[PDB]
């Protein structure tokens, strides 16, 4: 399996993640459940954090709203999910397949719980207050209804196999007996708002409830009354955001109770110090290890080497693992909240990978961290909208160019906390391409200019030193230099040659026009593609044969990839432009549009391509031979990038909300699926 940057855990679900001893962690994300092996079984270096994304539960067609592991010894491999598609599925995580399922619910399911006491019991509840009890082994059921209120959470008793606690949207908490046709045994009034979490005392009774009303309440089953009220402290920061108050009652420390707080802070409440309402802040000493937005779920995981771990899911899109013994953050697994549109490695900071995501946050992945496989920085300043284009500055470290789907073009400094400069001139459509190169008139009359291409077909030339100034339409220069009466084509791609002496423009009609410095004289037009040009890449200038740097790969809405050698036509320097209609090489194999191509900086004529067919293909372009096909993604690939340091390592991003880091040598398939 490849190293994976997963989709964000789902929000506002009382229980859409869970863990089992060993062990294995699973979290709902969009329509799937992603499994994470944690501990010795993850197979990681003694330095790097002991975890790894190993699998995915695929089958649901709508949002997964609930997830629960079977905590019965021997059946830690069984789990259950709930979905907005109306179904409850039982899974086998070792085969990622569905054992059995049901669709008994007639309304949108809220959550579900695997009974801690009965091997095959799974209780679920929907937003009309309907509860189904499901025994999957003998395929039995029990339609129940308690109160005409929206169910938010439910938790089976770990001690009594017939007791189930249910929390509602209005603050009502009930404990029912499922053997007595769902009779309300206790009715707990006190909360004024949504119940988010319900935890029973691990010792055989007491139970704790967490609510949006900022209070935690401990109740006694004997008296059916509340014995303790814990209100959240108004702590200091370390934006209108509502609270989510979830709980964990550690079986090791029955006198302690873990909860979330404002801003995603985690708290450990000492219940013996009742009147003192004494708590301890998680990672109280260290800064920046804590979540920055609210926490939704908490899952206890004891590893095989007896480590007490706690996993948290958050709105800040991080998944964190805490050591309960120290209350410190062991590690962090970042996640994506949208499409992975662009990938770009810096030529200055060689291992620095920038990721353009559809949730309005730029990720910078330090792929060279020895102690951390997921060293990822977030940048949300002045972005908001989807980042659809990225390009590092070629010489200035920490300077990143970015473009958004609403036509914005910006300059972000990642070494500092300076707000990004936003260009005044913007495109009427999505910025699909950015490129650095030598400034052309009128700008040249800065060392490098930032070029941006938008969906409307305009390519703007930006000034780095004066971003708020006026960006120039290069069509105004092309029209004059090459003397063109009729209108110019819709540009869809821009790619500079390595020497900065040649700029290539791809168009909606499928043609690629070849211009040259300093006035963009049209010396060549490639008529090969008959559909919109998506991507163009020039070969690097440090191959065995320096004549390789005249090779140009291109991808369009057709599945066929073309390579064109431009040694002759460029070195001939024709005053009359030349039309080329023959490919120097041809790469067939993909079955859908090509979104991205890139040359390996480690080899000669080795190309990687990203396609809507759901795969990435590695070619030996010179011999037109497919080498390996990566099929890890479940969606359509939007971008691909070669590791600058490892010749065997490639990164890819798709609309499945995933970035995969994979090895060419580990791929069994050689060509795309047919
Ligand atoms: C219009 N357009 C679409 N793409 C590619 O196609 C993806 C999305 O294309 P889309 O038109 O936004 O939606 P659709 O193709 O699924 O119907 C983007 O992530 C790009 O990789 C494009 N890529 C480039 N370079 N230029 C373009 O004008 C362009």
Swiss-Prot record:
Q: Can you quote a single GO CC term?
A: SMN-Sm protein complex
Mutation effect (residue 248 to A): No effect in interaction with U4 snRNA. No effect on interaction with SMN complex
Q: Does the keyword Phosphoprotein apply?
A: yes
Give the signal peptide, or none.
none
Main localization of the protein described in the UniProt heading: nucleus
Stated consequence of mutating residue 102 to R: In NEDCAM; uncertain significance
Q: Where are the WD repeats?
A: 59-101, 104-145, 147-186, 239-279, 291-332, 335-375, 382-422, 426-461, 485-525, 528-574, 589-629, 632-672
What does the UniProt entry say about where the protein is found? Answer: Nucleus, Nucleoplasm; Nucleus, Gem; Cytoplasm
Q: Name the segments for region: Important for interaction with U1 snRNA.
A: 1-121
Mutagenesis or variant effect for residue 293 to E: Abolishes interaction with U4 snRNA
| GO MF term list | mRNA 3'-UTR binding; ribosome binding; RNA 7-methylguanosine cap binding; RNA binding; snRNA binding; U1 snRNA binding; U4 snRNA binding; U4atac snRNA binding
* Phenotype upon changing residue 70 to P: In NEDCAM; uncertain significance
| UniProt keyword Ubl conjugation, yes or no | yes
The annotated region (Interaction with U4 snRNA) lies at 10-12
The reported effect of residue 563 to M is: In NEDCAM; uncertain significance
Q: What is known of its domains?
A: The WD repeat domain mediates binding to U1 snRNA and to U4 snRNA. The WD repeat domain also mediates binding to the 7-methylguanosine cap that is found both on mRNA and snRNA molecules. The regions that bind snRNA molecules and the isolated 7-methylguanosine cap overlap at least partially. Besides, the WD repeat domain mediates interaction with the 60S large ribosomal subunit.
Its protein name is: Gem-associated protein 5
Tell me the organism: Homo sapiens
Q: Which gene encodes it?
A: GEMIN5
Give the stretch of the parent protein shown, with its full length: 4 to 722 of 1508
């Amino acid at each position: 399996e490849p190293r994976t940057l997963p989709p964000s855990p789902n929000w506002y679900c009382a229980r859409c993640s869970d863990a089992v001893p060993g062990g294995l962690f699973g979290f709902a994300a969009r329509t799937s459940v992603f499994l994470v092996r944690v501990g010795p079984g993850a197979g990681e270096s003694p330095g790097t954090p002991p975890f790894r994304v190993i699998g995915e539960l695929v089958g649901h067609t709508e949002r997964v709203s609930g997830f629960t592991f079977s905590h019965h010894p021997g059946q830690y491999n069984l789990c259950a999910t709930s979905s907005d598609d109306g179904t409850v599925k039982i899974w086998d995580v070792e085969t990622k397949t569905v054992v059995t399922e049901h669709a008994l619910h007639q309304h949108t399911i809220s959550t579900l719980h695997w009974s801690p006491r009965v091997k095959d019991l799974i209780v679920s509840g929907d937003e009309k207050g309907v509860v189904f009890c499901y025994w999957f082994n003998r395929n039995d059921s029990q339609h129940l209804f308690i109160e005409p209120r929206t169910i938010f959470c439910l938790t089976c008793s770990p001690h009594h196999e017939d007791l189930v606690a249910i929390g509602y949207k209005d603050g009502i908490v009930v404990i029912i007996d499922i053997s007595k046709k769902g009779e309300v045994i206790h009715r707990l009034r006190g909360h004024d708002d949504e119940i988010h979490s319900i935890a029973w005392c691990p010792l055989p009774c007491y139970l704790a409830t967490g609510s949006k009303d900022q209070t935690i309440r401990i109740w006694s089953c004997s008296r059916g009354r509340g014995v303790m009220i814990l209100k959240l402290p108004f702590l200091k920061r370390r934006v209108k955001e509502r609270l989510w108050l979830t709980l964990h009652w550690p079986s090791n420390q029955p006198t302690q109770l873990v909860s979330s707080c404002f801003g995603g802070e985690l708290l450990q409440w000492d219940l013996t110090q009742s009147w003192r309402r004494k708590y301890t802040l998680f990672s109280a000493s260290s800064e920046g290890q804590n979540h920055s937005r609210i926490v939704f779920n908490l899952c206890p995981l004891q590893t095989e080497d007896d480590k007490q771990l706690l996993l948290s899911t958050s709105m800040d899109r991080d998944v964190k693992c805490w050591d309960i013994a120290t209350l410190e953050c062991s590690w962090t697994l970042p996640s994506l909240g949208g499409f992975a549109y662009s990938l770009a490695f810096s030529s200055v900071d060689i291992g620095s990978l920038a990721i353009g995501v559809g949730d309005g946050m730029i990720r910078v992945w330090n792929t060279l961290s020895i102690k951390n496989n997921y060293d990822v920085k977030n940048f949300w300043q002045g972005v908001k909208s989807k980042v659809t284009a990225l390009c590092w500055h070629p010489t200035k470290e920490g300077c990143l160019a970015f473009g958004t789907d609403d036509g914005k073009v910006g300059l972000y400094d990642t070494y500092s906390n300076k707000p990004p400069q936003i260009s005044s001139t913007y495109h009427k459509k999505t910025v699909y391409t950015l490129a650095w190169g030598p400034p052309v008139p009128p700008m040249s009359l800065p060392s490098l200019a930032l070029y941006s291409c938008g969906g409307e077909g305009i390519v703007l030339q930006h000034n780095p030193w004066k971003l708020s100034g006026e960006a120039f339409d290069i069509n105004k220069l092309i029209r004059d230099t090459n003397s063109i009466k009729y209108k110019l084509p819709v540009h869809t791609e821009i790619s500079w040659k390595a020497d900065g002496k040649i700029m290539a423009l791809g168009n909606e009609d499928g043609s690629i026009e070849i211009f040259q410095i300093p006035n963009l004289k049209l010396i060549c037009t490639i008529q090969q593609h008959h559909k919109l040009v998506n991507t163009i890449s020039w070969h690097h200038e440090h191959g065995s044969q320096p004549e390789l740097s005249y090779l140009m790969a291109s991808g369009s809405n057709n599945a066929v990839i073309y390579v064109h050698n431009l040694k002759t036509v460029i070195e001939s320097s024709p005053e009359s432009p030349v039309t080329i209609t023959e490919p120097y090489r041809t790469l067939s194999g993909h079955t859908a549009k090509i979104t991205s191509v890139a040359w390996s900086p480690h080899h000669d004529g080795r190309l990687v391509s990203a396609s809507y067919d759901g795969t990435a293909q590695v070619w030996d372009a010179l011999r037109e031979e497919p080498l390996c096909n990566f099929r890890g993604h479940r969606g359509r690939l939007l971008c691909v990038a070669w590791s600058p340091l490892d010749p065997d390592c490639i990164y890819s991003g798709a609309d499945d909300f995933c970035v995969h880091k994979w090895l060419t040598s580990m791929q069994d398939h050689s060509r795309p699926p047919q």
